[PDB]
Amino acid sequence: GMENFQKVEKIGEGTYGVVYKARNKLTGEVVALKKIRETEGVPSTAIREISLLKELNHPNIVKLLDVIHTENKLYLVFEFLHQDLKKFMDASALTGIPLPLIKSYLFQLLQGLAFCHSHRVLHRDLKPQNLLINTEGAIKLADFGLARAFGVVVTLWYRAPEILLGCKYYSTAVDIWSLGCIFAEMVTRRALFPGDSEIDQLFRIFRTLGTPDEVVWPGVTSMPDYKPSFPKWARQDFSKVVPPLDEDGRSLLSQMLHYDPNKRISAKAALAHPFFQDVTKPVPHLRL
Ligand SMILES: CC[C@H](CO)Nc1nc(NCc2ccccc2)c2[nH]nc(C(C)C)c2n1
Numbered sequence: 001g002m003e004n005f006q007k008v009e010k011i012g013e014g015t016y017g018v019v020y021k022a023r024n025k026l027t028g029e030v031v032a033l034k035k036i037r038e039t040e041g042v043p044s045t046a047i048r049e050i051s052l053l054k055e056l057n058h059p060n061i062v063k064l065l066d067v068i069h070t071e072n073k074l075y076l077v078f079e080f081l082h083q084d085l086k087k088f089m090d091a092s093a094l095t096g097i098p099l100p101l102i103k104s105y106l107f108q109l110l111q112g113l114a115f116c117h118s119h120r121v122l123h124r125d126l127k128p129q130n131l132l133i134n135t136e137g138a139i140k141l142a143d144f145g146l147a148r149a150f151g152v153v154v155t156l157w158y159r160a161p162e163i164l165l166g167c168k169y170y171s172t173a174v175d176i177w178s179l180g181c182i183f184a185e186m187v188t189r190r191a192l193f194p195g196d197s198e199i200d201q202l203f204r205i206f207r208t209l210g211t212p213d214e215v216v217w218p219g220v221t222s223m224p225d226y227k228p229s230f231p232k233w234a235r236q237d238f239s240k241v242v243p244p245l246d247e248d249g250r251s252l253l254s255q256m257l258h259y260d261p262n263k264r265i266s267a268k269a270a271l272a273h274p275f276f277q278d279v280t281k282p283v284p285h286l287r288l
Pocket residue numbers: 010011012013014015019021032033034062078079080081082083084129130131132142143
């Protein structure tokens with residue numbers, strides 16, 4: 001079974017298991033092989049969910065090539081891409097990723113999200129580390145719909161405030177928040193909200209966007225982890241938060257970072273925003 005694959009090198013530690021670059025001995029294709037990590041035997045719902053995921057195919061979603069439920073273990077075989085967006089951002093720190101490339105990437109991810117969301121599938125843990133790029137200018141979402149299949153230092157920087165405040169049931173809005181954080185980060189070359197605990201993450205959000213109340217976010221004061229005793233921070237103008245993001249970009253971003261999940265712009269509506277009026281598909285500068 002696994003004898004069909006030859007390890008080439010360790011790619012990294014995923015959320016649900018280790019990932020290796022590998023070669024299929026029969027077909028010669030190079031792939032990304034993931035071993036899913038209480039060992040009793042793969043749960044039936046994990047198997048049905050992942051099998052659902054195999055059929056959710058899109059150019060901006062990393063292809064799930066094979067689900068290998070063998071010997072009471074679970075291996076996932078994925079399409080391989082040569083680099084992730086975190087590494088590419090770090091690589092691009094001195095000059096920044098050119099705006100046209102930022103716009104193209106945001107546009108493509110919004111397409112991927114719109115597609116997943118239209119199928120009622122959430123990502124839940126969007127972050128630069130699981131965004132993957134190739135030499136032809138494509139960007140792809142990895143680990144989509146995995147959270148649902150399996151219910152799990154982890155980064156908090158991209159986590160929506162409703163999650164932080166204890167909301168039990170995520171909506172598609174949590175992915176829009178995350179992507180918004182990543183958008184700002186590509187533009188400014190600085191993480192928007194680099195929290196190192198849940199309360200630090202929350203307080204960093206509060207300090208920038210203002211401490212949320214019933215006016216901006218109805219029902220907020222009733223959430224499991226909301227405290228009347230939260231400090232009261234005033235909101236700051238975005239011109240100060242994300243230069244040199246232009247007026248169209250700042251307008252779109254504001255809509256992606258709305259506190260109330262129900263007011264937060266959808267992936268499909270975001271695609272129609274004037275920010276994408278001049279969108280094009282440039283090629284990244286990659287040296288591997
Ligand atoms: C470890 C999980 C994350 C996202 O799944 N990484 C990560 N990185 C990649 N390539 C970037 C890379 C290439 C060579 C060396 C190091 C990194 C990937 N290609 N295909 C996959 C699937 C498992 C989603 C993948 N995952």
